[PDB]
Amino acid sequence: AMETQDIIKRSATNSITPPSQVRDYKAEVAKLIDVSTCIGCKACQVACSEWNDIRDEVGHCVGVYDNPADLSAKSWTVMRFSETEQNGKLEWLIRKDGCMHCEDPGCLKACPSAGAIIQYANGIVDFQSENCIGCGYCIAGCPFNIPRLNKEDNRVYKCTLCVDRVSVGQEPACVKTCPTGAIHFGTKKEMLELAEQRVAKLKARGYEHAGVYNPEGVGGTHVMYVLHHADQPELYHGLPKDPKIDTSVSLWKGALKPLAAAGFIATFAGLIFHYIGIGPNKEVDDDEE
C-alpha cells in the first residue's frame, strides 16, 4: 500500500497519522456526462465490463429498457431510463449511473476498516480489497447508493474511474467508447469549462434551467453531469437534489467516537480512583480494629 505516495484520504485512519501524500502536486481529473447528448446505447456498460474483466448474469426484461436493473459487484455502471411529460411534452431522459468519486466521500467516512477505501490526489476514490471486511457500512454512507457487495468474496466493488488506465495516462474505457461524445474526460478544470459551454448552448435552445451537476454538499464530484433540467435532478431516475453525507452518519462517525472515548477514560479513572480511595467492601471492615 501507499506505493504512489499520493493518498490524500484513507478510511478508518486517525487524523493525526495521515496517509503518505507527498506526491500531491497533480491536477484533479474528471468525467463529464452530458445527458443531453446521450442516446442510451449502453456502450459504456459493455466497455466497462470488457475492460474490467467482469460479467454480470443474464437477467430478465420486466418492462423497461434498463438492464441490468441496478449496479452490482459485476456491473459497475448502468444506464437508467426515465419517460416523463412533466415538462410539457414527452421526453426520454437517459442517465449513466455509477460512482461519483466525491471530493468528500461518504463511503470512506463510514468505513471501519483501515485502508479499505482511499482517495488519490487526482480525485479518484478506490477500494483496496485486501482490507475490506464486508460490513457494508459504505453502502449506507454513500449519498448515491453506489457500493455493491460481491457474494463470492464478501467485498464491495464499484467504478474505479479506470484507475488502472488513468494512472498511466489513458482515459477510462467508457469515456473513449461513447458513440456520441456524451461522455468527456480530462482535468476537472477544463471539464467544468466544457460543462458551462454546453449549458450555454442548451439555454440557447430553450432549456432555461440547464445546469452542471457537481454537488457542493459532497465537496464537488469527479464525475459530473450536464442536465437539461438541473432544477429537477430527480427526473433522471432519482438523481438526488442537493446530496450530502447523512446527518446520522456524520454524528455516528464523528462526535460519538471521542465522546465515548472520554466516557471510557473517565469511567476507568473514576472506578480505579474509587477502589483505591474507599477500599473493598468486605464482610467486616469493623473487626479489623
Ligand X SMILES: CCCCCCCCCCCCCCCCCC(=O)OC[C@H](COP(=O)([O-])OCC(O)COP(=O)([O-])OC[C@@H](COC(=O)CCCCCCCCCCCCCCCCC)OC(=O)CCCCCCCCCCCCCCCCC)OC(=O)CCCCCCCCCCCCCCCCC
x/- track of binding to a copy of itself for residues 15-54 (CB under 8 A): --xxxxxxxxxx-------------------------xxx
Residues 107-146 that bind a copy of itself (CB under 8 A): 121, 129-130, 132
The one of a copy of itself, ligand X, ligand SF4, none whose footprint includes residue 258, by CB under 5 to 8 A per kind, is ligand X
Going by C-alpha positions, the residue among 88, 219, 69 that lies closest to residue 148 is: 69
Residue from 110, 111, 149, 191 binding another protein (CB under 8 A): 191
The SS3 call for residue 149 is strand
What is the distance, to the nearest Å, from the Cα of residue 60 to the centroid of all Cα atoms in its chain?
Answer: 28
The SS3 call for residue 185 is strand
Residue 55 in contact with a copy of itself, rule: CB under 8 A: yes
Residue 76 in contact with ligand SF4, rule: CB under 6 A: yes
x/- track of binding to another protein for residues 213-252 (CB under 8 A): ----------------------------------------
113, 119 Cβ separation under 8 angstroms: no
**CA 35 – CA 177 distance, rounded (Å):** 15
Q: Please tell me whether the peptide bond between 68 and the residue prior to it is cis, using omega within 30 degrees of 0.
A: yes
Q: Please tell me whether the peptide bond between 143 and the residue prior to it is cis, using omega within 30 degrees of 0.
A: no
Pick out the residues of the known binding site for [4Fe-4S] cluster: 38, 41, 44, 48, 99, 102, 107, 111, 132, 135, 138, 142, 159, 162, 174, 178
